[PDB]
């Protein structure tokens, strides 16, 4: 069973060819993988245990049925085909093998006891993790008489005491020395089945996974993964004293491989090292698309290809996905400087606000969606809970802190009593949060960016009143926003006709990976610095704003707006990869700031 | 004695005839034993009415003991299986046997099963609660002595058991007087298992008494049958729990039958015959059902035409990843005493998955989903509300104007995106709640009055008014003639306890509940040639409600009514494309809903 399988696996690893494409025939597929493993670190080999289903079918029966008596063979049979690069580079740990599956195999509700201890794949949404837990591997005993130190191994899954000192023979003198033994790591994680793929009218389950030595911190709460690993069940004891174990076992999953393919979202900020992992064939594409005279309007108009025109709101929500530069003000003692853009959408009903939030929330990774009455003051920022076991008050994070890199869509912004609305004043302007409660005195921080939607008071935009009276928000809160979009839309007989003609079409029947990669690039390798010709159009653009907004009674302008222009101007330069702010990048993001309140 | 019973059961298992097989006299258990011998089946529901056909004595002594006999049967079949086609005779069982209740017994209630029926075959009826999830329960623990190279087993009966540290093989002990033996989860045998509680129907309880519970240990093949919050009927032995003389008892289920329909789960038996296709093919099949909805109620010819569309429901699209809901919501604003809480009570019973709720007796977290703690574990768990338990069905909320205003905005989420997004301090998820809501309310202060216009004797914020595709508006117009016919209807009802002979006798409830389930799965389309008609209609609406002094708030969410209120009709007529005759029916409905004011 052991020798008969490495011989059959090496063949696979050597002679395999696929009708597929990788990294955008080079026959030695897994030998090329094994070469890459040698040119860099990271001694793991991600094998797809379906390729081994084409090449063979009598190991693919024994890999998903005796996985713990096979995967060691799959390590050994890779160490030897590493002969090509043995002398060249000599790493230390070992080479590894990690079967997986592109597509899931089961749910969390159809795990049956004919599947105990055999490879299994599920999918879910990690809820919470834990801190590391040691786990002994090699004991280390020592006698009190002979003071002789033997080192017994854990082979089957338990540690046996020798009870005879190889020198003095006192028949029990061998204590166990803890901190001289060898330990390994172990983490406990909880999945939660996705809303899709669950029965009619039911509540999500959870499943406990156990990570191990190297996978120990490779996932975060809030991630959607495709875990692959063995499925085990261990007994439990009714007393922690007697050996009377129960008869109903308890199951978990010894994870073996993760996979976070989130193509429905963009790129999270764990892949900044992975931006250097772009095909140079692609950087040409991006740099060339960034030269067309209107790449702004060509990318913007590709957001949410179901909303009708609304041309400006998509401009704003596109500049929000880039944000101003991240300058480093630690020297001037000023503190830090917000670089993300907060957008407010106000306008009479039916104008498709909540659809834009529902679209963004499903686009950006690390986001949240909240509402008006179903969210409290402390549930948005940070609460203090009586931890159940230890009976102690411990801190937790709300919604505005769980996002932290992304967008916190807050629908129904009007219908939040003024208490829970005055909480956003801190987290949305300084990017911080200062907590001082019973035993907890700390100061969090986050890099969120609100995107709120409200209705006018009376829910009807009556043009008799003044703009600062249909909104009915204070000034110490309207100034923390910098793009207040008034969707003033009546019954334009032409607009209604065009919209209906568009909506009906959805009943008969640019790319993403351009945008999904353009964004990662424009985040990784761009930092627009102002100029002197741009800086000289930014001063007057604020001295006129005052005289304008003073009289009309619409919305006054405080010096904070002069920073927003910066935030907007720079954010425009990033769209075209210009790496330097010039004049036009101020006129554009000034016309945008002016022609939104009209 | 029993040695002669093991023969009187083999006779019956090998000899029994049956005619209803649609063929000649075959063997009901003759085929079963072959299937079981070929490992194509697991359970063998030995009916007891068939033993009570040729031996009404054995039935008397089964329901008297039912614990020995359920073992004699599993020995009889154990012997007969080889004759058709390890050491302990239970590790190689790989099938189980269950008694299907005898027809002569009567289904008790939970309160009735007393101590005088411990160890007998009983039958209870109740509502499920707190069904667990499947977990592996051991039956035959397999140990191994690694030293002497052997295999040993032991069978388990109690909910606990003490393992072995012997290796009692006298040879291993005799040779060396030393050796331990490991447990092992490969050679052993598990079996599915889950426990679930039952409660009395709060109907069949003394006027103010507390309902009592019982515990059910479902295991083997009956698992995953019952869902929590469900009417069920269980058949199984009633035993005490092992480990002074008082004892706690559980029901050990042998057969579980869903009785949702008040008779027996007949949803899977929804077969329409050609003699019914006769009716469904008639010219006005849509108009027979409309008249056969709550026939006890005179008048309201049009409301019953819309309450049917609500039960059928439109079709739901997904273009470019932009979901559109395919359910319909309906409100019934109207004067007092117009039989609205009768219409709702009827639409509750005509739906497979339904729920009933009252505005003044239900809190906003009890509709959607609530997070609640367990004082036994301190762990917060989720618990679905009304809209979750009514996932693929209908929810009914009467007294809708009296629901507290902070407990009513918790419906805006379920009416458009049809999820529930919880971010409380234990959980962070989105449950699926695809329910279609039907609500009733009184206009202003009990009665409509012609002084104040609409929107002020309705009192709904436009954001919620627009969620309803049809806000139907009835009145208690005291027209002398209209009252005379209504009275001559109700007095006929109170004389004969039936409705007066109508043009077409109403279909049974049991038959409509099938006619509709067959009429859901069509998915018609829309023809392009109609997009010009529809459009104009919509445009005209935006004119009237813009050039009037009473009309409600109409928006771009009205077009999708016309669209999704016509794919319902075209779904009744069994067409597979929407035709210009249904668009006009839809348009008439959306007009006959506010004419009751002119
Ligand atoms: Zn010693
Ligand atoms: Zn032995």
Swiss-Prot record, chain A:
Record domain MCM: where: 295-504
An example Gene Ontology CC term for this record: nucleoplasm
EC number: 3.6.4.12
Positions contributing to ATP 1 binding: 334, 480, 560, 563
Keyword Ribosomal protein part of the UniProt annotation: no
Modification comment: Sumoylated; SUMO2 modified in response to stress caused by inhibition of proteasome activity (in vitro).
Record keyword Protein biosynthesis present: no
Localization in the cell: Nucleus; Chromosome
Keywords, in A-Z order: Acetylation, ATP-binding, Cell cycle, Chromosome, DNA replication, DNA-binding, Helicase, Hydrolase, Isopeptide bond, Nucleotide-binding, Nucleus, Phosphoprotein, Ubl conjugation
Motif Arginine finger positions after renumbering to this chain: 479-482
N6-acetyllysine: residues bearing it: 57, 287
Function: Acts as a component of the MCM2-7 complex (MCM complex) which is the replicative helicase essential for 'once per cell cycle' DNA replication initiation and elongation in eukaryotic cells. Core component of CDC45-MCM-GINS (CMG) helicase, the molecular machine that unwinds template DNA during replication, and around which the replisome is built.
Stated family: Belongs to the MCM family.
Name the UniProt record assigns to this protein: DNA replication licensing factor MCM4
Residues of the full protein shown: 158 to 770 of 863
Curated annotation (Swiss-Prot), chain B:
Binding site for ATP 2: 467, 557
GO biological process, one term: DNA replication initiation
Post-translational modification: O-glycosylated (O-GlcNAcylated), in a cell cycle-dependent manner. Ubiquitinated by ECS(LRR1) E3 ubiquitin-protein ligase complex when forks converge following formation of DNA interstrand cross-links. During mitosis, ubiquitinated by TRAIP when forks converge following formation of DNA interstrand cross-links. Short ubiquitin chains on MCM7 promote recruitment of DNA glycosylase NEIL3. If the interstrand cross-link cannot be cleaved by NEIL3, the ubiquitin chains continue to grow on MCM7, promoting the unloading of the CMG helicase complex by the VCP/p97 ATPase.
Molecular function as annotated in GO: ATP binding; ATP hydrolysis activity; DNA helicase activity; single-stranded DNA binding
Main localization (coarse): nucleus
Amino-acid positions noted as binding ATP 1 in the UniProt annotation, renumbered to this chain: 298, 337, 339-341, 442
EC number: 3.6.4.12
Cross-link for Glycyl lysine isopeptide (Lys-Gly) (interchain with G-Cter in SUMO2), residue positions: 11, 24
Positions of transmembrane segments: none
Keywords tagged on the record: Acetylation, ATP-binding, Cell cycle, Chromosome, DNA replication, DNA-binding, Glycoprotein, Helicase, Hydrolase, Isopeptide bond, Nucleotide-binding, Nucleus, Phosphoprotein, Ubl conjugation
Ranges where the MCM domain occurs: 285-491
Cellular compartments annotated: Nucleus; Chromosome
Modified residues (Phosphoserine): 267, 318, 453
Stretches for region Interaction with RAD17: 474-517
Signal peptide (residue range): none
Positions of short motif Arginine finger: 466-469
A family per Pfam: MCM_OB
Catalytic activities: ATP + H2O = ADP + phosphate + H(+)
GO CC, any one term: membrane
Subunit structure: Component of the MCM2-7 complex. The complex forms a toroidal hexameric ring with the proposed subunit order MCM2-MCM6-MCM4-MCM7-MCM3-MCM5. Component of the CMG helicase complex, a hexameric ring of related MCM2-7 subunits stabilized by CDC45 and the tetrameric GINS complex. Interacts with the ATR-ATRIP complex and with RAD17. Interacts with TIPIN. Interacts with MCMBP. Interacts with ANKRD17. Component of the replisome complex composed of at least DONSON, MCM2, MCM7, PCNA and TICRR.
Miscellaneous section: Early fractionation of eukaryotic MCM proteins yielded a variety of dimeric, trimeric and tetrameric complexes with unclear biological significance. Specifically a MCM467 subcomplex is shown to have in vitro helicase activity which is inhibited by the MCM2 subunit. The MCM2-7 hexamer is the proposed physiological active complex.
PANTHER family xref list: DNA REPLICATION LICENSING FACTOR MCM FAMILY MEMBER, DNA REPLICATION LICENSING FACTOR MCM7
Family: Belongs to the MCM family.
Task performed by this protein: Acts as a component of the MCM2-7 complex (MCM complex) which is the replicative helicase essential for 'once per cell cycle' DNA replication initiation and elongation in eukaryotic cells. Core component of CDC45-MCM-GINS (CMG) helicase, the molecular machine that unwinds template DNA during replication, and around which the replisome is built.
Designated name of the protein: DNA replication licensing factor MCM7
Lineage of producing organism: Eukaryota, Metazoa, Chordata, Craniata, Vertebrata
Gene name tied to this protein: MCM7
């Amino acid at each position: 069973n052991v020798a008969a399988c490495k011989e059959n696996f090496q063949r696979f690893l050597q002679r395999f060819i696929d009708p597929l494409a990788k990294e955008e025939i080079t026959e030695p597929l897994y030998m090329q993988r094994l070469g890459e493993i040698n040119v860099i670190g990271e001694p793991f080999l991600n094998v797809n245990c379906e390729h081994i289903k084409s090449f063979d079918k009598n190991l693919y029966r024994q890999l998903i049925s005796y996985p713990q008596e096979v995967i060691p063979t799959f390590d050994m049979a890779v160490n030897e085909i590493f002969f090509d690069r043995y002398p060249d580079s000599i790493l230390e740990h070992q080479i590894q093998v990690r079967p997986f599956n592109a597509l899931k195999t089961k749910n969390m509700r159809n795990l049956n006891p004919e599947d105990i201890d055999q490879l299994i794949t599920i999918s879910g949404m990690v809820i919470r993790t834990s801190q590391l837990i040691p786990e002994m591997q090699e004991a280390f005993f020592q006698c009190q008489v002979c003071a002789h130190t033997t080192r017994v191994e854990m082979d089957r899954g338990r540690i046996a005491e020798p009870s005879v000192c190889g020198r003095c023979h006192t028949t029990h003198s061998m204590a166990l020395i803890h901190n001289r033994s060898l330990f390994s790591d172990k983490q406990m994680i909880k999945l939660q089945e996705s809303p899709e793929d669950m029965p009619a009218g039911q509540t999500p389950h959870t499943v406990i996974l156990f990570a191990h030595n190297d996978l120990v911190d490779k996932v975060q709460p809030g991630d959607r993964v495709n875990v692959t690993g063995i499925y085990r069940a261990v007994p439990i004891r009714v007393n922690p004293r007697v050996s009377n174990v129960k008869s109903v076992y308890k199951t978990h999953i010894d994870v073996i491989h993760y996979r976070k393919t989130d193509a429905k979202r963009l790129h999270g900020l764990d892949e900044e090292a992975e931006q250097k992992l772009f095909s140079e064939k692609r950087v040409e594409l991006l740099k060339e698309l960034s030269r067309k005279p209107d790449i702004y309007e060509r990318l913007a108009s590709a957001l949410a290809p179901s909303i009708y025109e609304h041309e400006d709101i998509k401009k704003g929500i596109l500049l929000q996905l880039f944000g101003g530069t991240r300058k480093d003000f630690s020297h001037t003692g000023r503190g830090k400087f917000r670089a993300e853009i907060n957008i407010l959408l106000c306008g009479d009903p039916g104008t498709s606000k909540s659809q834009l939030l529902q679209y963004v929330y499903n686009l950006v990774p690390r986001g949240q969606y909240t509402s008006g009455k179903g969210s409290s003051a402390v549930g948005l920022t940070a609460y203090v809970m009586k931890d159940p076991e230890t009976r102690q008050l411990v801190l937790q994070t709300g919604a505005l802190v769980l996002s932290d890199n992304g967008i916190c869509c807050i629908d129904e912004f009007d219908k939040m009593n003024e208490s829970t609305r005055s909480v956003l004043h801190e987290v949305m302007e300084q990017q911080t949060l200062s907590i001082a409660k019973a035993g907890i005195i700390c100061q969090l921080n986050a890099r969120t960016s609100v995107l709120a939607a409200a209705n006018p008071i009376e829910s009807q935009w009556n043009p008799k009143k003044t703009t600062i009276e249909n909104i009915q928000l204070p000034h110490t809160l309207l100034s923390r926003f910098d793009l207040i979009f008034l969707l003033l839309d009546p019954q334009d007989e032409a607009y209604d006709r065009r919209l209906a003609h568009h909506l009906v079409a959805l009943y008969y029947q640019l790319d993403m990976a351009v945008l999904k990669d353009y964004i990662a690039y424009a985040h990784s390798t761009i930092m627009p610095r102002l100029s002197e010709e741009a800086s000289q159009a930014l001063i007057e653009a604020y001295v006129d704003m005052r005289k304008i907004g003073s009289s009309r009674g619409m919305v006054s302008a405080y010096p904070r707006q002069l920073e927003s222009l910066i935030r907007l101007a720079e954010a425009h330069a990033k769209v075209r990869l210009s790496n330097k702010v010039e004049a036009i990048d101020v006129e554009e993001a000034k016309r945008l700031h002016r022609e939104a309140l009209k | 004695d029993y040695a002669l019973e093991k023969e009187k059961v083999k006779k019956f298992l090998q000899e029994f005839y049956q005619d209803d097989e649609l063929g000649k006299k075959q063997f009901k258990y003759g085929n079963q034993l072959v299937r079981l011998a070929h490992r194509e089946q697991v359970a063998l529901y030995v009916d007891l009415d068939d033993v009570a056909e040729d031996d009404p004595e054995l039935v008397d002594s089964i329901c008297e003991n039912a614990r020995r006999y359920a073992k004699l049967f599993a020995d009889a079949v154990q012997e007969l299986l080889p004759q058709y086609k390890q050491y302990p005779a239970e590790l190689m069982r790989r099938f189980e046997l269950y008694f299907q209740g005898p027809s002569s017994n009567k289904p008790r209630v939970i309160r009735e099963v007393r101590a005088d029926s411990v160890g007998k075959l009983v039958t209870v009826r109740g509502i499920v609660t707190r069904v667990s999830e499947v977990k592996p329960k051991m039956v035959v623990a397999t140990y191994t002595c690694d030293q002497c190279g052997a295999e040993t087993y032991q069978p388990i009966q109690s909910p606990t058991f003490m393992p072995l540290i012997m290796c009692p093989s006298q040879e291993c002990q005799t040779n060396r007087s030393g050796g331990r033996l490991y447990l092992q989860t490969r050679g052993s045998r598990f079996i599915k298992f889950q426990e679930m509680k039952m409660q009395e129907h709060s109907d069949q309880v003394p006027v103010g008494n507390i309902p009592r519970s019982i515990t059910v240990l479902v295991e083997g093949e009956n698992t995953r049958i019952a869902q929590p919050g469900d009417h069920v009927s269980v058949t199984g032995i009633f035993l005490p729990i092992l480990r002074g003389l008082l004892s706690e008892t559980y029901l050990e289920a042998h057969r579980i039958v869903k009785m949702n329909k008040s008779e027996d789960d007949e949803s899977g038996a929804g077969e329409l015959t050609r003699e019914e296709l006769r009716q469904i093919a008639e010219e006005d099949f849509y108009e027979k059902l409309a008249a056969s909805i709550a026939p006890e109620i005179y008048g309201h010819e049009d409301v019953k035409k819309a309450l049917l569309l609500l039960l059928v429901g439109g079709v739901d699209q997904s273009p470019r990843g932009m979901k559109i809901r395919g359910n319909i919501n309906i409100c019934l604003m109207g004067d007092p005493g117009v039989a609205k809480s009768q219409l709702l009570s009827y639409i509750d019973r005509l739906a497979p998955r339904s729920q009933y709720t009252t505005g003044r007796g239900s809190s906003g977290v009890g509709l959607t989903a609530a997070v609640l703690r367990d004082s036994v574990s301190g762990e917060l768990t989720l618990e679905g509300g009304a809209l979750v338990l009514a996932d693929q069905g209908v929810c009914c909320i009467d007294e809708f104007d009296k629901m507290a205003e902070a407990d009513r905005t918790a419906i805006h989420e379920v009416m458009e995106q049809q999820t529930i997004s919880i971010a409380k301090a234990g959980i962070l998820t989105t449950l699926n709640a695809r329910c279609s809501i039907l609500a009733a309310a009184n206009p202003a202060y009990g009665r409509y009055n012609p002084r104040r216009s609409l929107e002020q004797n309705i009192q709904l914020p436009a954001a919620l008014l627009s969620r309803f595709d049809l806000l139907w508006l009835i009145q208690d117009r005291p027209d002398r003639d209209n009252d005379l016919r209504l009275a001559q209807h109700i007095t006929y009802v109170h004389q004969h306890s039936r409705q007066p002979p109508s043009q077409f006798e109403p279909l049974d409830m049991k038959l409509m509940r099938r006619y509709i389930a067959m009429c859901r799965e069509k998915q018609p389309m829309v023809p392009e040639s109609l997009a010009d008609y529809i459009t104009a209609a919509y445009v005209e609406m935006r004119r009237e409600a813009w050039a009037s002094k009473d009309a409600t708030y109409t928006s771009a969410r009205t077009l999708l009514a016309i669209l999704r209120l016509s794919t319902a009709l075209a779904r009744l007529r069994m067409v597979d494309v929407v035709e210009k005759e249904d668009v006009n029916e839809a348009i008439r409905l959306m007009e006959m809903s506010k004419d009751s004011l002119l």
